[PDB]
Amino acid sequence: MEELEQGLLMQPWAWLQLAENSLLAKVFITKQGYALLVSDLQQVWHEQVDTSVVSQRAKELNKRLTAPPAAFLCHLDNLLRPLLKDATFSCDCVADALILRVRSELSGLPFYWNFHCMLASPSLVSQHLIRPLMGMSLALQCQVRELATLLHMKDLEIQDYQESGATLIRDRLKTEPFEENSFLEQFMIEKLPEACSIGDGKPFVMNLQDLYMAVTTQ
Amino acid sequence: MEELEQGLLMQPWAWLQLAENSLLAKVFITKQGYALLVSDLQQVWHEQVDTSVVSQRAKELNKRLTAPPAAFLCHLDNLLRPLLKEATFSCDCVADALILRVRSELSGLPFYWNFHCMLASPSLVSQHLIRPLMGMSLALQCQVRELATLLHMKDLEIQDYQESGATLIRDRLKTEPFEENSFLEQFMIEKLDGKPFVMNLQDLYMAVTTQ
């Protein structure tokens, strides 16, 4: 309560090591456990179960729990590296039920364990999974616009330097001042097909993640 | 599969002028049923069902008044015409028994209407819409990098402007050598509800939502 979202949104946007898919999934190491949180505004598949219900489902519904939850907590706590040092997470995308079989393997014999994507908690998701839109707007879509304005005053300084002497001579630096409208129009008409850069999320791990943490800090 | 949602996504979002909340609703009612996509940012009404609910609403209150479905769809199309330049819905501050109240004085006798609402699904906010938002964020990052490179090359050209320049300088605007630490510090420390989101991104959202 008021600690899982605060202690979970801080997870850097790091790609989970799936064999095939390139989904955006983040989870942060929390002493109270873990809860895989995904945000895309259309349909949630988030693992979050009450302690009591999983308790009964382990006592008189699941007979495979041959390892105490203390072992799982210890494994969760003693995992400082986010990226694999070289436990590959394989998925079989053959049907609607995406059963991401998380093979719990520490060293040697792979322990048999599997996940299940049940319904998430209504209150927490409905209250804290709409914030990222406003958090992005208020911070990033103001900082970027202020950077653009700083460029605009730099262009103004260049142009009134030019009008007050220091006339440009060589053609190599002979460039027109930047215009946002003309740049947008030329992007739409000429370089939009060639600027489509998605791939596997190259900036997702080098620029998007850190700036998003800066966005999601507040 | 894709036709209806592809056509509806091109339709611009219609913010309802209620001055009490943020409403991000899509309306496009021309053919193939009615697309009354009412969403309060927490529960979208996937009201794409057939004439069953329309007929039950029109008949359970009107035992002597009937209108054809063609008239219903024409009225639905004409519903929000004088609003995109009233059809206002008012919520309340009461518990989970959400009963909307319409107390407009039109004939002296209050008019009674019920707003059917189902349970809000907590599995409705993590699949698609941020992926185009991530594309727009990538476009914004590319624009920021382009503007930063333009700033850098203009700074280099300004470095040419002191040996062939020496123009009128107020002496309070000297250009120090560019330092990444100072740039990041000034970008971070100093220049760091829902209504500002919509009234700041309604115009920008249509730019990249297509391609």
């Binding site: - | 009107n62 002597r64 008044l65 209108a67 008239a71 024409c74 009225h75 004409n78 519903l79 009233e86 059809a87 407009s104 004085e105 039109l106 004939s107 006798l109 008019f111 209407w113």
Partner: protein, 96 residues
């Protein structure tokens, strides 16, 4: 007051506009551009009136009929009152 709220709910309009429409339609005055189709269906023996616009059918009102037993007296009083008000208007006109 049986069927009036639909004409304020369907096209979501408030009072005053309907009052103004009634005042400028029931009284004298008509528009040459806007044709009026006052279809009184005597052949079908069913009394109803319709106002057609933008090739769609809507509702305006309903008027059940109950036969009056003294039409001659009311019509004679009506024409007498019309003549009296003509005389009064002419007298005021000449005085003015």
């Amino acid at each position: 007051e049986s069927e009036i709220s639909q004409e304020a709910d369907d096209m979501a309009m408030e009072k005053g506009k309907y009052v103004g429409e009634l005042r400028k339609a029931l009284l004298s005055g008509a528009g040459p551009a806007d044709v009026y189709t006052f279809n009184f269906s005597k052949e079908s023996c069913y009394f109803f009136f319709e106002k057609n616009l933008k090739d769609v059918s809507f509702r305006l009102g309903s008027f059940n009929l109950e036969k009056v037993e003294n039409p001659a007296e009311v019509i004679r009083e009506l024409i007498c009152y019309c003549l009296d008000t003509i005389a009064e208007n002419q007298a005021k006109n000449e005085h003015l």
